[PDB]
Amino acid sequence: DYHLETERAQRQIKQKNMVDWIVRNVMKSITPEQERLMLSKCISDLKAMSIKA
């Protein structure tokens, strides 16, 4: 039970800091060229929904 609790605690801590680092890196992952590409893709999706009337 001690080994199970130790491994589960380490797994939970690893998951928590991985999630926080992923959030921070995603907030650091935005580039203006990719922002323009995502805006163009959103406009294309909105136009595709406009076709589906």
Binding site: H3, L4, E7, R11
Partner: protein, 161 residues
Amino acid sequence: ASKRIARSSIDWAKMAESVPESQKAMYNQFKAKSDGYIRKALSYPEQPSPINWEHYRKSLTNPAMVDAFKKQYEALKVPYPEDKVSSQIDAQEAEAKKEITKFIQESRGRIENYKAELGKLGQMIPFEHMTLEDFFEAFPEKVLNPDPPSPNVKKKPFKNN
């Protein structure tokens, strides 16, 4: 296992047919104190809970610790505890056998005496046909010249003062 701990006992039915209550009131302890060794015998089995190693293998990313602990558990076996009271109980049993043999010999002697007295009283001449000398032969207390006398030779006319 649970053979000689959980599912065995000694027949107390023949034990209670001899004990003279207040003479052997320690039997009330003996039936009770040993029952305490039966009460803890209700608990304490050999393997109280088998370990599901598959559950720990599924619940752990690395199952090598589970296999190592299973190997260590299988490699260790506890044997039966040491005994040093067997010789003491055998000595008590031998002393009991000697005292029982002596008591049986005394009982045989007392039985022979009682049977001789019963046979003698059966073979006595009846009191209806008994002269006053045959009674004094069969009961040799009599009344003699060097004896405490009385005109009513009774069981309490002399001394008692």
